[PDB]
Amino acid sequence: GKGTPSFGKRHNKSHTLCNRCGRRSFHVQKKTCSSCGYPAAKTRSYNWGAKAKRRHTTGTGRMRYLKHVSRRFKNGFQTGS
Amino acid sequence: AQRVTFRRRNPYNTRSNKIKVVKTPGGILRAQHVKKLATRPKCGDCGSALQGISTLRPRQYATVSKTHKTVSRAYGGSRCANCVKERIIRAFLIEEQKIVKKVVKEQTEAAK
Amino acid sequence: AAQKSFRIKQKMAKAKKQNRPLPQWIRLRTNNTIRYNAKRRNWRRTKMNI
RNA sequence: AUUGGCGAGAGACCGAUAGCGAACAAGUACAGUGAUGGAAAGAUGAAAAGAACUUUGAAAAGAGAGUGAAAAAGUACGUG
RNA sequence: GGUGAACUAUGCCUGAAUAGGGUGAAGCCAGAGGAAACUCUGGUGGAGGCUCGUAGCGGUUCUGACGUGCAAAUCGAUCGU
RNA sequence: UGGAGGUCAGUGACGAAGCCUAGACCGUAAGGUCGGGUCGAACGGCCUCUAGUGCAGAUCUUGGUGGUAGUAGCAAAUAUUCAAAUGAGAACUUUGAAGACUGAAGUGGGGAAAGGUUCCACGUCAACAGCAGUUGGACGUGGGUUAGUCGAUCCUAAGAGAUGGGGAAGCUCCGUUUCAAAGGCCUGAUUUUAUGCAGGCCACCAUCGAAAGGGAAUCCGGUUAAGAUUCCGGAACCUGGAUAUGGAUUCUUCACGGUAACGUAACUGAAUGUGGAGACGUCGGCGCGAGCCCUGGGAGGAGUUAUCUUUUCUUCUUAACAGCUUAUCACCCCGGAAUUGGUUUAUCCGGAGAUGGGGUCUUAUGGCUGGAAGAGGCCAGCACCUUUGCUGGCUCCGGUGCGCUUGUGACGGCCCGUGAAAAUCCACAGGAAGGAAUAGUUUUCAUGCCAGGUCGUACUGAUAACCGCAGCAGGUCUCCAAGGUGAACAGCCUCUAGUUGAUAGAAUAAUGUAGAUAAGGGAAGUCGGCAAAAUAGAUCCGUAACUUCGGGAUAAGGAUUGGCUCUAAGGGUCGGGUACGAUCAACUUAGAACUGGUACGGACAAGGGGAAUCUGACUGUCUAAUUAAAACAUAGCAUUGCGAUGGUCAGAAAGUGAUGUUGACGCAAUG
RNA sequence: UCUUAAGGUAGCCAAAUGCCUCGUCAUCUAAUUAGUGACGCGCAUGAAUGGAUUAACGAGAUUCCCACUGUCCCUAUCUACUAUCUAGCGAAACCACAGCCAAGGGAACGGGCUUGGCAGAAUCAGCGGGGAAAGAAGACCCUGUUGAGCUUGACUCUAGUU
RNA sequence: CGUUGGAUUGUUCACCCACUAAUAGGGAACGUGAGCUGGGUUUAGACCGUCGUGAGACAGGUUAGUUUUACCCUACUGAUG
RNA sequence: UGUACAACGGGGUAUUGUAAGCAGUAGAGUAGCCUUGUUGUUACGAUCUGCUGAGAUUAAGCCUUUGUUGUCUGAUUUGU
RNA sequence: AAACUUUCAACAACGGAUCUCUUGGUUCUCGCAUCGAUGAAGAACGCAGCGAAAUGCGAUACGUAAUGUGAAUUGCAGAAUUCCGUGAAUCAUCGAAUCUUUGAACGCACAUUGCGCCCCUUGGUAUUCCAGGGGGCAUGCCUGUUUGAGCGUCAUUU
């Protein structure tokens, strides 16, 4: 049986959590994340994957630094009190 | 009777997962984990077992005293007694033959 | 498994503390439409699959 | 030039199966090993005033009573 | 342009698993017959991609059950090893 | 019909829009207008503008809902019953009692992957547990995982992969030591001057990769609701870190002894080099040990005892660690061996020294003692409404074996197969560096000091904790393994432990599914003996054609088998004058009477056989889920290419690759 | 002699290969398109596209014999669980509307239409005649200026190689 | 009102052996697969012969090859009302 | 309130095949006494014999309660 | 005659159509130019008196500082004269900071909360060992510094 009896045999994760994105997409044997391309320098992205680009892009996170850049520009990148 | 279980998390009958059954003062049978048996050190030339040298694991050899790891003879803990005897005899005899060969070569050249 | 790694154990802890019903006072807060924890998880129902 | 970013003003546009997938804890919940896929879900009332109290029931609840302009608005709520 | 060898196919590395019987190969001991050559007999021993047959692995037939099933391939008995 | 411009200073919270109404009117109709209910904030006529503008269908889309229908069904895994309690409520919860089951390759006790809190305690019906539920792996709230010693961590395996370099427009590809200038431990320097310096050795040739490989070291008893080789008590060990105390030379500086194998409490340490351990398959029998099983005496407890049984069942245990003592092999001295001898289960060994005598060693393994009886276990006794203790006895001595399993040892088969590594730790030739007289050497001899981080640890591991949509008869790696029968971890029954779970009640029509039986016939059934039956274990007798001499063969074909009472054979330890017996009952075989409803491998278990033909030689493999075959493979046979600047095959390219750690007895391609 | 180089040798055969064909002869049976043994002008056997043979082996195909029997004559009975009735729980496939026939005509096989037969609530268990029952935009066939896998002396090219 | 039992063949037809009173011929969607069976034909595996350069072809021969569902309405058979 | 019905027990009937227990100088045999061997006896012993066509079962789809013991006024509907 | 079946109405029933609504979309237009090794975008784990998310934030953790405003926040509860005031706030503004583990991610690794090495301090009668506190150690390239290498090569040598 290629169905249920063979499904009984799947207990070895081919993917684990990825350091760069916590997506369970890090292929263990290939040592590459199938989602972000880790450990390559460039995050994996394709122009046929517009939904994927939406999921992984600027503004989908906290923007811990980039959120204040517009305010600082609007103020002229001032310094002082 | 009383059935035992493995004491470590290794569930397999591996060479490093060997157990004996022992009876404890609590009256119950327990699995004791038995380490690998040590192999006798071998002679460097014969490859035969060296007597007067203890059987220990290599790291166990570091804790013991020097007299357990060698013999009072030259080449003691490294070569067999018969090996050392054969090498002494061979060394002396071949060097004597070297002297004789040197003398005979010199004397035949002087005659020539 | 019993012999976990710290990353997996940390994910376990995060999921365990997340898995709790909604506090009773957030319901009473004004302009509040949240009535229950929608992101609730049971270990049999839905696997985290990490 | 500018289907991105920031700010602003509009429309003979759409009006919750429409308009962006998403008017809501929406790229969320869940499905896949993975690349990826990806919903449903708005409306009490002006104000909770969200039904004290009495009775039957083990209880849910019912029957009275009560608030309310309306309970032919009772949270399973605008007409339904 | 990307994802997949968690099933499966094949190689490699490192581990683990496999009752009890039948047969009785080399090697070996002893004995008998014979003029000799040699032949023969009894033991011993424990071979084999041998064999009956558990666990295991598989899946022949019933074209059995079930076939809006326990199950998108299972169940039972018979079977192969 | 939705929007837009004008207008009706249009309708409306004194009720707009929507919606319901076998009420009315109008129009041929599309439709318009109104009456009555519901309600709650906007809407319409007219002249024009505009379009995402009209539905019965598209196996249309999305939601919702039917008949079927209280129907199919909830029937595999032997099975439940009585009482009490709790409760509103009990077939299902709990506790007793009974009956059972798994039957030690378990329905038991642990783990690996996976899950992730399911573990454990406390509260009840909303959901869930295809009946119920007071129960739950559900719900809510909480608690729970303690390490120097167990793992990870360290090492390397197949392999992955930076660098140097070289490709590629490039994302990147190759490559892993290559056409590269590739780094780290001791005293002098260790303060008018720093880690600067003729101070030395030199030359791993990144790194990642195993919770089953290699590897430093922990055990017992107790303790929790839930953790324990982790906590506590006791007792140890390993690793890493300067002087100390004792013990070992000094009118011979790094010890003595023994013929020797070698011994001992020690008994210097650098480069350099070398050796060993790490470090290895499988099968067969033999030997030894551990545990278990079996059994005798004795000291306790329990069961029946209308008849019997010095009966039947159960406790009598000794962990790591320390010391001494024990070894088959192997080795050493004396010694000379044919009348060859010693010897194993298994012709192996001996003038290259057998036998004999005497010794040396490894310590697997066992014994004794310490640990340690103070522990644990088994018995008996003291306040009786306070979170509860104490005291007395025992815990003894033995046997047995083709027993089971495990480990070890000496061996013997097997291969055109000979069963690779690395870290790490020891050792061996060398004396480079020191001193002899209130000290100079020893931290490889004893004793004493300190520390040992980080992360995992709960639980299930499966007919309910994983995967299969699920609490799915499926799938999923492994360890321990009692008694009887028996060849047997097969089938049957039973101790320990666990479970009694699967919706139930009543009745017993047809037809089913599963299991059986059948007169006489015996394949006449049918495509076909499909299915079933018959056979079957063991002992003895007997056994053909053919043959590649190995087989065929369990050929075919016959007989016997119980119980009881006996008989016989098969063995270990002991001595002689001043041709032998023993407190020994450990199981195999053969025979003899006797005996019974012609029974007896009495259940279980367990080949049907023969004569031929076609085909494939055989074991082996494949169409997971309709084809296991005559198909594929195979050994054997033959052909082909190629001598390396090569053949065959990769790569976009490459200072790139596979064969190739290769070399014609080889690679590669075929039949 | 001719095609086209040679003409099928050893063997084997109505063979898993023989149409004619159930070939002819023998045997096996009471009877045999089966089986085996022979015979071959063999549509269209044949030699590593291997021929012939072959012990042992075979969940391979086939014939016969013995044993055995419910396959059958020719059926009968028994057990467990169902079905069945009840408590609880409770789907689905299907569904234009529906559901009595005969003939006629009709898209030439009607539940409806025409002419006849007829025709009485509500229903339960079975059943498999019908619903040209259900399951799937026939997989056969054809068509389409619709494909795809494979092959080659197709057309047009191409990596490699020379 | 009857019109059989068999050998061979998947066969319809055949053709024999017999019995018989007789072994007449046909239809019912070439009656009858939610009635069976699956021998044949008629998927995919495989062998052969001939054909084809080849892939492949061959109402030529061989061997192995999943036969699903009624609980509804009618009809029918019985059973209440 | 009937020689009514039922639950047990004898009988009839039938099925099987001779029950437990007790006894026997029965039984193939295995091991000795001394009171000097025609029954002295023990630790046993499958089977055999007698009581014993015994015992057990017998309507659940075969009968009486001449024996014992009990049962006999519960709920719905019916218009000429 | 009832039951049953159909049709209609009333009321009551899952359903959520219609109507009205709308802090949302979608198009058009105008203006602007500002991410990152001074560590970005993204990820993980945590932080609230009582909370897990595109709320906010980082062990100074629903935030600190500065500034403005001027009395809140609010579901409940609270340190406090916080109220004619250097002063409430889930306020606004925002120029000072903090900014855990990561990430181009930088000591080497990373399916490990794994291993180093270098300075200074403290503790253990310690420059070496262990521990604690702090600060560091990537690669390519540029300019400069210092130390070098090469008979590649220039001025002195019987």
Side-chain angles (χ1 to χ4, degrees), chain A residues 42-76:
Chain A
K42 274 181 314 149
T43 36
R44 197 189 74 117
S45 164
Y46 296 107
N47 281 337
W48 39 269
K51 283 207 180 187
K53 268 200 229 263
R54 269 206 306 248
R55 292 165 204 139
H56 252 168
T57 194
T58 316
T60 55
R62 313 167 37 158
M63 299 237 297
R64 299 189 312 249
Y65 170 77
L66 194 45
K67 65 204 316 156
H68 314 302
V69 174
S70 265
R71 190 182 84 228
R72 296 205 293 138
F73 157 83
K74 183 270 271 193
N75 280 318

Side-chain angles (χ1 to χ4, degrees), chain B residues 21-87:
Chain B
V21 182
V22 290
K23 221 189 217 144
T24 46
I28 60 157
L29 286 174
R30 307 274 212 58
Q32 143 171 352
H33 273 264
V34 46
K35 327 212 212 149
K36 288 150 139 217
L37 274 320
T39 293
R40 252 183 122 187
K42 313 302 196 237
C43 168
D45 324 316
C46 297
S48 51
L50 290 181
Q51 72 170 99
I53 288 84
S54 316
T55 53
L56 303 147
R57 296 318 256 183
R59 200 117 183 222
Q60 297 192 306
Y61 275 121
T63 86
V64 303
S65 146
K66 199 174 180 229
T67 209
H68 305 347
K69 318 179 250 176
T70 165
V71 180
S72 305
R73 193 181 37 261
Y75 284 98
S78 194
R79 262 121 188 81
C80 163
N82 291 29
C83 260
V84 175
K85 157 161 161 77
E86 161 145 323
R87 302 180 48 138

